[PDB]
Amino acid sequence: APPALWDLAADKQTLQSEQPLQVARCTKIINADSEDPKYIINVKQFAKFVVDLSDQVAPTDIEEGMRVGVDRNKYQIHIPLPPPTVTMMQVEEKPDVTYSDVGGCKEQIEKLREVVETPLLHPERFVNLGIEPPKGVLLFGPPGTGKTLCARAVANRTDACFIRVIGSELVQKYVGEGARMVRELFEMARTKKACLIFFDEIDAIGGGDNEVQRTMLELINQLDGFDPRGNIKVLMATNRPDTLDPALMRPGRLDRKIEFSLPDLEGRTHIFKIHARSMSVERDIRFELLARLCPNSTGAEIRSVCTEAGMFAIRARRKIATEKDFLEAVNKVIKSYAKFS
Amino acid sequence: FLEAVDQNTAIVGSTTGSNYYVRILSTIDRELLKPNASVALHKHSNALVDVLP
Amino acid sequence: REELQLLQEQGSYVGEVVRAMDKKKVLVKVHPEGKFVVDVDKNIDINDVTPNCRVALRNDSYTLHKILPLDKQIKEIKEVIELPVKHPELFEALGIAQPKGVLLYGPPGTGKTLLARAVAHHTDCTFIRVSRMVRELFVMAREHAPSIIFMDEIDSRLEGGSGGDSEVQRTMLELLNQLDGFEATKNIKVIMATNRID
Amino acid sequence: EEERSKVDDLRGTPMSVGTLEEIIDDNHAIVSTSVGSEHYVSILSFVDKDLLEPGCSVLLNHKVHAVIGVLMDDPLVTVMKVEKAPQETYADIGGLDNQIQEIKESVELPLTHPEYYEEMGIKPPKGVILYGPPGTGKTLLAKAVANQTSATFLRVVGSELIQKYLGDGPKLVRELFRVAEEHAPSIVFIDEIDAIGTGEREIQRTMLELLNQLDGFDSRGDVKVIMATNRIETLDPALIRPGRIDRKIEFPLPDEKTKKRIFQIHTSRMTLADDVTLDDLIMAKDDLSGADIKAICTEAGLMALRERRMKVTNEDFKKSKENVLYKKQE
Amino acid sequence: AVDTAEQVYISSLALLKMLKHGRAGVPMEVMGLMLGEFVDDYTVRVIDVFAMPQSGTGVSVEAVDPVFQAKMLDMLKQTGRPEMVVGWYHSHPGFGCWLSGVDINTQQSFEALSERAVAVVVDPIQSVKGKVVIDAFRLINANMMVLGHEPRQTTSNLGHLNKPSIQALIHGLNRHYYSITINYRKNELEQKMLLNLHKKSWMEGLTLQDYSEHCKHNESVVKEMLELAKNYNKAVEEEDKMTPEQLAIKNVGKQDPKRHLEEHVDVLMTSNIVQCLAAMLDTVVFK
Numbered sequence A: 001a002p003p004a005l006w007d008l009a010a011d012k013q014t015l016q017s018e019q020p021l022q023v024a025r026c027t028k029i030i031n032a033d034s035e036d037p038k039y040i041i042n043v044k045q046f047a048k049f050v051v052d053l054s055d056q057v058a059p060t061d062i063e064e065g066m067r068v069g070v071d072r073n074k075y076q077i078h079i080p081l082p083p084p085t086v087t088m089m090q091v092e093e094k095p096d097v098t099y100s101d102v103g104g105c106k107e108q109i110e111k112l113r114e115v116v117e118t119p120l121l122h123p124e125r126f127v128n129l130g131i132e133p134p135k136g137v138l139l140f141g142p143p144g145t146g147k148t149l150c151a152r153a154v155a156n157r158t159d160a161c162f163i164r165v166i167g168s169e170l171v172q173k174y175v176g177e178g179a180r181m182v183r184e185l186f187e188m189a190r191t192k193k194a195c196l197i198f199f200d201e202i203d204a205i206g207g208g209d210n211e212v213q214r215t216m217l218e219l220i221n222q223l224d225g226f227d228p229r230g231n232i233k234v235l236m237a238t239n240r241p242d243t244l245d246p247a248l249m250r251p252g253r254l255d256r257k258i259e260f261s262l263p264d265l266e267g268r269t270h271i272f273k274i275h276a277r278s279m280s281v282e283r284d285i286r287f288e289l290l291a292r293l294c295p296n297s298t299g300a301e302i303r304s305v306c307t308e309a310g311m312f313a314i315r316a317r318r319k320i321a322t323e324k325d326f327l328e329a330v331n332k333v334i335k336s337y338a339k340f341s
Numbered sequence B: 001f002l003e004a005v006d007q008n009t010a011i012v013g014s015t016t017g018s019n020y021y022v023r024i025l026s027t028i029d030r031e032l033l034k035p036n037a038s039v040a041l042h043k044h045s046n047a048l049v050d051v052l053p
Numbered sequence C: 001r002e003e004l005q006l007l008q009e010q011g012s013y014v015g016e017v018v019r020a021m022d023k024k025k026v027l028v029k030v031h032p033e034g035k036f037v038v039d040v041d042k043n044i045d046i047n048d049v050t051p052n053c054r055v056a057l058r059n060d061s062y063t064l065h066k067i068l069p070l071d072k073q074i075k076e077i078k079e080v081i082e083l084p085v086k087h088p089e090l091f092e093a094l095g096i097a098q099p100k101g102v103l104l105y106g107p108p109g110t111g112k113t114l115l116a117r118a119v120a121h122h123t124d125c126t127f128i129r130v131s132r133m134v135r136e137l138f139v140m141a142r143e144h145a146p147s148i149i150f151m152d153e154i155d156s157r158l159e160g161g162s163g164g165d166s167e168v169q170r171t172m173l174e175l176l177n178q179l180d181g182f183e184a185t186k187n188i189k190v191i192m193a194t195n196r197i198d
Numbered sequence D: 001e002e003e004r005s006k007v008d009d010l011r012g013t014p015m016s017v018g019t020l021e022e023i024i025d026d027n028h029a030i031v032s033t034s035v036g037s038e039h040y041v042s043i044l045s046f047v048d049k050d051l052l053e054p055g056c057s058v059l060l061n062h063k064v065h066a067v068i069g070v071l072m073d074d075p076l077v078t079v080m081k082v083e084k085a086p087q088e089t090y091a092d093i094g095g096l097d098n099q100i101q102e103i104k105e106s107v108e109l110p111l112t113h114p115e116y117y118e119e120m121g122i123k124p125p126k127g128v129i130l131y132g133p134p135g136t137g138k139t140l141l142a143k144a145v146a147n148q149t150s151a152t153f154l155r156v157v158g159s160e161l162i163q164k165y166l167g168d169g170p171k172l173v174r175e176l177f178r179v180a181e182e183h184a185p186s187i188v189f190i191d192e193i194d195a196i197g198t199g200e201r202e203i204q205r206t207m208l209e210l211l212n213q214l215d216g217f218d219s220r221g222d223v224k225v226i227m228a229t230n231r232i233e234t235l236d237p238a239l240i241r242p243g244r245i246d247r248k249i250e251f252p253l254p255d256e257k258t259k260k261r262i263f264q265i266h267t268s269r270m271t272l273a274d275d276v277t278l279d280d281l282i283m284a285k286d287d288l289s290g291a292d293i294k295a296i297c298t299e300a301g302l303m304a305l306r307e308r309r310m311k312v313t314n315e316d317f318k319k320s321k322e323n324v325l326y327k328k329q330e
Numbered sequence E: 001a002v003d004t005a006e007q008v009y010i011s012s013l014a015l016l017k018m019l020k021h022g023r024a025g026v027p028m029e030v031m032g033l034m035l036g037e038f039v040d041d042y043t044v045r046v047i048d049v050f051a052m053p054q055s056g057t058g059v060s061v062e063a064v065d066p067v068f069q070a071k072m073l074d075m076l077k078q079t080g081r082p083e084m085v086v087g088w089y090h091s092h093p094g095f096g097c098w099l100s101g102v103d104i105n106t107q108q109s110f111e112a113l114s115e116r117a118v119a120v121v122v123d124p125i126q127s128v129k130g131k132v133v134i135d136a137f138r139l140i141n142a143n144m145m146v147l148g149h150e151p152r153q154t155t156s157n158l159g160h161l162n163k164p165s166i167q168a169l170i171h172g173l174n175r176h177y178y179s180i181t182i183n184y185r186k187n188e189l190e191q192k193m194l195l196n197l198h199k200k201s202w203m204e205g206l207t208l209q210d211y212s213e214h215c216k217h218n219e220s221v222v223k224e225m226l227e228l229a230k231n232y233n234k235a236v237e238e239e240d241k242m243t244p245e246q247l248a249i250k251n252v253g254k255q256d257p258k259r260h261l262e263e264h265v266d267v268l269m270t271s272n273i274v275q276c277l278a279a280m281l282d283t284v285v286f287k
Ligand SMILES: [Zn+2]
Pocket: E095
């Protein structure tokens, strides 16, 4: 009632303001436009309507399938309005793994580094020295320590960490949202001054499935279609090559298929070097010792070594972590788990 | 017709499924008060004149 | 002809109240695209309108109108059925501890329906038969208490089926708690029937 | 008074009950109905617009649908969590001292005793996920009860709340996520996880969406989620890597000694006779939880209490033990 | 600041023009203009009423063509119609006789010249043919909300204004929107011309033609109606044979809503046509 007091006294002008803004035709969405005067519209009640455009809304502000306010008496469009939660939910701006986690691939890290680092740092060198900067690379095959080079690519940008997109969010109820999703994230890609966009888990949208063929074939129409951009970045991550449609449509714009299986002996000590900012590691602990005392120890597996070993370091009630206290967690988490797997 | 709640007044189910509460006319006797009958009201007055066999 | 304007009202709807509100604004569940909450007319009180019941509501004013809805066997049974025939009033005077019920075990050839309906036909009283759906007939037996009730359909280790059967065992245990509990009315005499391990 | 009793024309005869969809910052919200009628009108008094929690039923009219007020209405939310502080601590049960110090050390280190948690710089705000073969709230609530001593608690028991109604979706999970957001110093406890074990096609997508929102893709370290099921084989392998990422443990078989300890705890406050033997009580049982032995301790204390005595004799505790012998065999 | 008790005079001209205009009252919005003369403050008389061509826009201020309106009004001025416009009328089918925002806006715009601005809405679509009760509408001043709403004297006729007592429109939208009473007028020329015209509309040409038709149809066609009439008479007498048993048993209360008397009285009235027309045949045969 105290909140309704000042607004109750401010309800006087609501009667003189009730005559305007009264228009509401259930916010019917349009379908297309044959000519500029007549617009074909479809209401949610499965009734297709046609009306001419009003003088208060410009014809350039009309978008295909846009929910806007429309009169229920003159049937004209008085004023538009800007308005799924997974789209804005999928926005990611967070610092993560830096370049220090190169997984032993000496040549591959340059094959992708010359396309993730150099085109942004040298825009004119690739336009004058050639015809355009390269397109991108293709990381697939065995998972192993996957998604580590994805965070490496996110933090590798010297300006601002960019958005990454997983593919497991498109297989949901009420299919068809994929079209507007990719068109509005590519529209926001046009808004972000030619920013780079990463697309993870293509296997969750590739390989009935015609309702998925709409989103993935339209996705190909939006990648091969240079309308948003045909030069920024192309990269797909999949576990199996059983996606034949992106494999046959990828030679048009995608290129440079590479592999990333496991790091080398000199790499695991560098993942430990990026874990030097993790849970407190005493100076007595040698990264080369713990790195050389565990073969087949990809960055994800040793990330789990620092996870379970971190848990046992917490359970130990100690001020700092010592290798002699969690080495049992290391060889237990790699060997007791390496027994069956 | 669905049910008769009292004398000279009853309820009647419309064709669209919605049930209507309309006072029946005094000229019609109690013979037309059959629960399972084909009653017919008016299009505007919504009053019953005679039932259909 | 004064009612002809109420004919022009295009009739009225059938309201069904599901929940009453203390602000004198009772919400009424109506036909789809309905659910119209409104204050009832002034000549009808609010507290009398009970929820979960159908009422009469007008289609425009939304005002409520009213609430809407064998010689040896007969020789041995004369003391059981022929006793409440001629002297139903002086049961309170009779202090000989009349039995509450009687059982008849054996092959139900003659005596299950012809005897009860014949001697009860001489009693000229109503004859209620049993024929979960086993409690509403017991409530009807509570309403119409003076009658001759006879088990006919039920006559045909612990387990859940013996718990569900134990609901009817509880029904007859409260028949011994009502009959043997306290005589609510004269002439309460029943006949049992059982032919198997039960 | 007159200004308070003048808006009665809007809430009078032309009044309806609609369903609001969302609230727009432009002070005109969008509502819906059985046919989904979208009308936007400037707000009026009697509304809150903050605690309204859009997506519920609101008040409409036969007019241009100016919102004159709101009407609140869910009893299932009340039975979700308990708001009391039970006296059962982590020192009232024995034998699993390591098994209880693993979860006590796991989720009692964040937000409490923070020198071993924030100085390391890890912050895995995911929590452990356990499972009790007996379950029935006894073992899983006897392990989760350690956090209930001095802290806010959040409880979720059974997947019926999703399956007892139409497929509304993960909106209830969003309600638990916003009450957990406003109640960050809490512990999320999901019990009786039998979503896929009990349309069926929507259960998989609201369960995978439960895994999506439970992962915390946009939220920082806010709450520790502890899940608890009965059978570890019912859960799909996809609910593991985005789910249980910290640690999990196994619970031993309660045949004789764990039932001897459960019997000791359930018979520590009560008074029993000298002739009450233990071997027959830990012998006649076979794969029993603590709810039935607590039930026979309750009906044994009341049955022995019928004679105005608190001592439970041996013959009366065997007479109450017949309920245990019959109940599991029925 | 002064108000009186006004009453709208309605002759058969505007009535029949609103009946033909009601027959042409298609769902599409229609337009019309009322004419008359203002003699004093509290009386208004309508004489001339015509229709307007329909438009896709409907009832609006833009649909009113001032050169067409003033052209037809000038053509009425060159003829024997020296009356100025007094108001405008239209039809509101289906959604009720109430006035929308556009109608009250064009009413507010059209009331700047005439202070009275009589408004009438005819709706014969859902109205039964038993009653042709029509109502005239008025516009209230927005500045009178502080003082009394309608300071109209002679509150006797409000009982006659209470006949449209719909529980949604009149007091469902009575705020800023009231009405006015309606009376009629009929001179002797309309009374005798229209009365004799209607009696003749129910009579014959020479008035002697269709008499012998029924007088001689009593022997050919009415005999079937007399035999069937006796079939209904006996069809009730078969129950009237059972009536003296109930009347000989209970004698208390009535349970059958059928009277069995007035229907037979009506059968006798239909049977008396033979008696009344027998003298007619006697006159035709005589002379
Ligand atoms: Zn209209």
